[PDB]
Design a binder for this molecule. Structure first.
Ligand code: NA
Ligand code: NA
Lengths: 250, 250
């Protein structure tokens, strides 16, 4: 069975000083767990994440990364910077960046390649907008996004790639996809991965569900055969909530 | 007179571990100077900048910042995060972001506002492309960018705002604007600032020149009455080069 992954996307919240406290509390309170936990804070919080969590079972990663290895790209952060900090993951193609920053499938693929080269696992996000869902095109749209975002992306193994299905209409709206609909989409995604990398590879890739995941609905979502964890937004900000999610994962 | 400012924009280079060494060497080799020095590294390098440069005369800052205070903006860094780290500055509207990230004057204005609220000084970049310069419209174009980028931007005082004039054609091309052309542009910019904030304010605002600034041309650029320092790109990557620029500033 695929090991569960609970990744907390703090988005643009907290300061480095506030994060130090949060991480220290998590370290002291963290019980022994079989599943995998990871926190994905803003760029300037990564150093303290490394400092406080490096020796714990809790991993960490970035919320974005440059499509370039280095250069005249003011404001951008490179994969080499992230690997120097020991990031295990980095989100690429999050809905918010595809929407607010015009990130294309092609750009997301490049970012994924930069991460792979440095041994960082991309958490590649795909998901359809409400309009597409209502027209009954959720699966074709999401698969098209997945294939486009994986163009030229060839991970060393299934452990080096994570896919996160986050329907846009489920982000911060309180309206999560039902476990059944999530399961159906993950099945489609996994089949697409099998065609892309082979069955052995696809059967081992962790596919997380994201979009209003919380302590009240996580257990049922995680019970779905093809749902391997969650990309948690709002519910990862409060330590008690994050811990509750980790206990559910076990 | 206006205190000179030499700000090094490393763009996307180095790692936190490499920066720790660089900053520590700068700290040990830094001679007493009248002018102000600042280094602007990538986001994840800011914590070590704070650690090593805290007690020194060298300031530091970011290369970008979110237009929002906080929220669901995956990948973005807030002004509050930068304030927590003691950043004195943050670049906004760098030509690379206006081009590669489609940043508009309106967006840049919001970023500047976020910085002001947190007591961080924006280093607002404005500049024209080669064809505009050749058409003899460098000033009108640049002033329009300045005015749009300062919409709703009301600093507490002139010490809280820095303008950087960087001709797009002078970035990484090796061809810096002549001291005469830079002076002419800075005069136009300062006059615009006077109409916007009054003469007392405008006469105290530091207007830096950027675009292929190096040890060979910095002295003459700095000699111009309205050029108050430089936003240094490639020439700020090597410590010896940065130190040379600081010695020139005095
Ligand atoms: Na499951
Ligand atoms: Na001068």
């Amino acid at each position: 069975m695929r090991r569960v992954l609970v990744a907390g996307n703090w988005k643009m919240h907290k300061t480095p000083s506030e994060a130090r406290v949060w991480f220290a509390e998590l370290k002291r309170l963290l019980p022994p767990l079989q599943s995998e936990a990871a926190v994905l804070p803003a760029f300037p919080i990564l150093p303290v994440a490394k400092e406080v969590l490096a020796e714990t079972q809790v991993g960490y990663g970035a919320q974005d990364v440059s499509a370039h290895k280095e250069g005249a790209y003011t404001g951008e952060v490179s994969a080499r910077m992230l690997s120097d900090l020991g990031c295990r993951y980095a989100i690429v193609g999050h809905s918010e960046r595809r929407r607010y920053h015009g990130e294309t499938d092609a750009l997301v693929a490049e970012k994924a390649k930069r991460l792979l080269e440095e041994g960082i696992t991309p958490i590649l996000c795909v998901g359809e907008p409400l309009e597409v869902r209502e027209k009954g095109e959720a699966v074709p749209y999401t698969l098209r996004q997945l294939r486009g975002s994986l163009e030229g992306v060839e991970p060393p193994g299934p452990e080096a790639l994570v896919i996160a299905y986050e329907p846009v209409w489920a982000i911060g709206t309180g309206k999560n996809a039902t476990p059944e609909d999530a399961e159906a989409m993950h099945q489609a995604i996994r089949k697409a991965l099998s065609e892309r990398y082979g069955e052995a590879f696809a059967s081992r890739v962790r596919i997380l569900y994201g979009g209003s995941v919380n302590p009240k609905n996580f257990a049922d979502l995680l019970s779905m055969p093809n749902v391997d964890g969650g990309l948690v937004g709002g519910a990862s900000l409060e330590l008690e909530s994050f811990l509750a999610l980790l206990r559910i994962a076990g």
